[PDB]
Amino acid sequence: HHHHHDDLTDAELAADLAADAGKLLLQVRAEIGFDQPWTLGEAGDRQANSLLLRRLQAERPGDAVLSEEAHDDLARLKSDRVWIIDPLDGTREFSTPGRDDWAVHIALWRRSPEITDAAVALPARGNVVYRTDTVTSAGVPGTLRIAVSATRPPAVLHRIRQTLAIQPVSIGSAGAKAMAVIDGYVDAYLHAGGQWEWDSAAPAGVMLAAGMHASRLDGSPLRYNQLDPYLPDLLMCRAEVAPILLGAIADAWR
Numbered sequence: 001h002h003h004h005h006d007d008l009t010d011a012e013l014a015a016d017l018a019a020d021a022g023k024l025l026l027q028v029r030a031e032i033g034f035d036q037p038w039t040l041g042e043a044g045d046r047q048a049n050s051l052l053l054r055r056l057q058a059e060r061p062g063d064a065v066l067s068e069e070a071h072d073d074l075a076r077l078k079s080d081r082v083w084i085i086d087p088l089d090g091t092r093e094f095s096t097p098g099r100d101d102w103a104v105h106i107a108l109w110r111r112s113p114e115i116t117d118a119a120v121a122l123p124a125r126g127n128v129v130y131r132t133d134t135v136t137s138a139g140v141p142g143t144l145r146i147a148v149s150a151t152r153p154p155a156v157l158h159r160i161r162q163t164l165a166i167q168p169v170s171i172g173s174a175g176a177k178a179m180a181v182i183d184g185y186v187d188a189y190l191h192a193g194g195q196w197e198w199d200s201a202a203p204a205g206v207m208l209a210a211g212m213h214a215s216r217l218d219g220s221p222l223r224y225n226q227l228d229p230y231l232p233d234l235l236m237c238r239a240e241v242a243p244i245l246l247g248a249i250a251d252a253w254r
């Protein structure tokens with residue numbers, strides 16, 4: 001087609017990088033197999049990262065990149081365009097036979113909603129790719145399904161469950177849990193206790209593009225391209241359930 005107002009829009013590129021890294025991760029899984037989960041996870045992280053950095057340098061040579069699997073030289077702090085990527089989110093689950101709760105996260109941050117374009121691939125689920133440019137956008141829910149980490153679920157859940165009826169759904173991957181909200185498999189994804197920008201940036205972009213809610217647990221906006229890319233808590237959910245959950249979280253501090 002004509003150039004937007006090989007060359008892709010940033011959203012198309014986000015989507016194409018996510019799929020391509022997804023295919024490579026699927027190849028790595030088939031090749032290395034599961035006998036040594038540490039070895040499998042390492043190669044997954046490293047090979048996906050290599051592919052992503054190669055393609056970003058070739059196809060967006062002027063953009064900065066923040067990746068979990070690369071040293072951070074902080075030049076991004078001066079740029080107006082920064083790719084925030086997780087080459088493999090849910091390394092643990094990827095490394096486990098039969099599991100499909102792992103993801104590739106490709107977010108574009110642009111200086112000003114700072115995550116303007118994003119994609120989340122779930123390679124083991126037919127390599128589906130959720131993208132900000134094609135995702136589309138209720139009531140009083142007496143009981144809530146909330147996706148939480150299968151490894152390190154947040155302690156604050158215990159407190160809010162004293163007053164809200166909640167069933168926690170234990171799932172790996174920030175990306176997988178966020179897309180479960182998009183799918184309607186759960187009502188919300190709640191995390192506390194630690195995380196990094198690459199874990200949530202692409203899922204946040206997609207969530208917001210879908211007209212859904214994405215914020216810090218205290219309700220304040222998720223902020224990206226920070227000096228310290230540590231970003232330890234989030235709420236992602238249907239718009240309707242955000243005041244209920246944000247309120248319950250707030251009341252947990254009373």
Ligand SMILES: Nc1ncnc2c1ncn2[C@@H]1O[C@H](COP(=O)(O)O)[C@@H](OP(=O)(O)O)[C@H]1O
Pocket residue numbers: 068086088089090091092148149150151152171172173174175192193194195196199
């Ligand atoms: N308390 C914590 N501190 C730091 N990172 C965390 C964390 N809890 C979860 N994460 C990261 O968030 C991602 C999804 O976690 P989970 O599967 O537990 O929900 C994983 O990233 P990676 O797999 O990219 O390393 C995991 O390492």
Ligand SMILES: [Mg+2]
Pocket residue numbers: 068086087088089090091
């Ligand atoms: Mg990772």
